[PDB]
Structure 1
Amino acid sequence: MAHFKEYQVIGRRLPTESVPEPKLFRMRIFASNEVIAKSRYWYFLQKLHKVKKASGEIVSINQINEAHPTKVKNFGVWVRYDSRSGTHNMYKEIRDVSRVAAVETLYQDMAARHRARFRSIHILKVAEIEKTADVKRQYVKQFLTKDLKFPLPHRVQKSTKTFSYKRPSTFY
């Protein structure tokens, strides 16, 4: 949807005479700005409680900065998505350095692999994976072997002028 921020959002059915101080419910929402994030908040709240923006009220809307933004983390991600033929539940695993960075690339993968646009996707849970060997998918497990190294063959260097008088070399 853009580059993502993560918000804590809090709202509560409008106070009534006979029921003042209603319950307060929170969601963590991944959106690109605070306006979309409250649109989203209300989107899901109406999928659980009887409320709608018209009869409720946001109480607090707060960015949640990554606690350890240079600590490489193995994330497990849980997602609901509709495909063309129907609607399904997935679990993927993203190895990035901050929840917000990873939710970003999830959305890329869903779009690339399963053609799911943003509207069709429900993040259900994103959480850090504490022990290794709770990592399931192998496209992550690769990157947790000990003393790991790898080269980057066939190096291509972006030419700056239209012509060239050498003849390139993909060496690295």
Structure 2
Amino acid sequence: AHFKEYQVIGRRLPTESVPEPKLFRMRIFASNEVIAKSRYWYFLQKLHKVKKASGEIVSINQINEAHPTKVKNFGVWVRYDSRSGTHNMYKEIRDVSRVAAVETLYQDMAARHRARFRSIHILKVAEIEKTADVKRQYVKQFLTKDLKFPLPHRVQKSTKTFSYKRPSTFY
């Protein structure tokens, strides 16, 4: 759905032997908090000897974009399962927020590699601070000075079944 980014902090259940266990945090993209907590345990069980019944969620907080109205170049690292094997992949997305870039990324993976949501791990999302560090040409072509382009062959929308003149595609 429409993705939100949450920080989720968890811990192991306190014991007499080990009071005050370590606090672990990660950033999760999800459509709501219920899915976000479920994803937290999914990745935590891949890194530490712990599960939901043996731990607790300390705090979950939504993270908002610092400058949501600024165009940014994002570099994304992903790991996904194909029909035969697992692969790592780096892609670049141009958007105005992290959640917007992540939503585009899932659409791109589904369209070009037929990868569903369950088959994708988001490794890292980072904004590229400087030009010439962009390494994909389909993103670099929008960084040219004084970029202009037309929109040829405009197709207008008709609210009536019949029209009394031949339409034009001028723009």
Instruction: Give, in angstroms, the shift of residue 162 of structure 1.
Output: 1.1
Aligned residues: 171
Q: Per the alignment, in what secondary structure is the counterpart of residue 162 of structure 2?
A: coil
* 1:113 corresponds to: 112
Which stretches of structure 1, 4 residues or longer, exceed 3 Å deviation after superposition?
A: none
CA deviation profile, 1:38-68 (whole Å, cap 9, x unmatched): 0000000000001101100000000000000
For structure 2, list consecutive stretches of 5 or more residues without a partner in the other structure.
none
Q: For the residues of structure 1 that align with 2:112 and 2:145, how far apart are their CA atoms?
A: 30
Question: Shift in Å at residue 18 of structure 1?
Answer: 1.0
CA distance in 2, matches of 1:14, 1:168: 70
Q: Determine helix, strand or coil for the equivalent of 1:12.
A: strand
Q: Measure how far apart 1:167 and its partner are.
A: 1.1
Q: Which residue of 1 aligns with 2:167?
A: 168
**Other structure's SS at 1:62 match:** strand
Q: How far apart, CA to CA, are the structure 1 residues paired with 2:7 and 2:158?
A: 46
CA distance in 1 between partners of 2:121 and 2:30 (Å): 12
Tell me how far apart the structure 2 counterparts of residues 150 and 131 of structure 1 sit (CA, whole Å): 24
Deviation at residue 97 of structure 1 after TM alignment: 0.5
Instruction: Return the offset for 1:85.
Output: 1.1
**Cα distance in structure 2, aligned partners of 1:133 and 1:165:** 53
Name the structure 2 match of 1:30.
Answer: 29
SS of the residue 1:43 aligns to? helix
**CA–CA distance in 1 between the matches of 2:110 and 2:152?**
28
Aligned Cα root-mean-square deviation (Å): 0.5
Q: Secondary structure at the match of 1:41?
A: helix
In structure 2, how many angstroms separate the alpha carbons of the residues matched to 1:73 and 1:171? 33
* d(CA) in 1 for partners of 2:103, 2:66: 17
Structure 1, residues 97-156: CA drift from partner, whole Å, max 9, x if none? 000001001000000000000000000000000001101111100100001100011000
Post-superposition offset of 1:169: 0.6
Q: Secondary structure at the match of 2:125?
A: strand
Cα distance in 2 for residues equivalent to 1:109 and 1:35: 25
The alpha-carbon deviation at position 14 of structure 1 amounts to 0.5
Distance (Å, rounded) in 2 between the aligned partners of 1:12 and 1:162: 63
Using the alignment, how far apart are the partners of 1:85 and 1:164 within structure 2? Answer: 53
- For residues 17 and 167 of structure 1, the distance between their equivalents in structure 2, rounded to whole angstroms, comes to 83
**Residue 149 (structure 1) aligns with:** 148
TM-score under structure 1 length normalisation: 0.99
Q: Percent identity?
A: 100
SS where residue 12 of structure 2 aligns? coil
In the other structure, the counterpart of 2:63 is: 64
Aligned partners of 2:165 and 2:11: how far apart in 1? Answer: 68
SS of equivalent residue, structure 1 residue 9: strand
Matches of 1:134 and 1:166 in 2, distance apart?
A: 52
- Structure 1 residue 22 displacement after superposition: 0.4
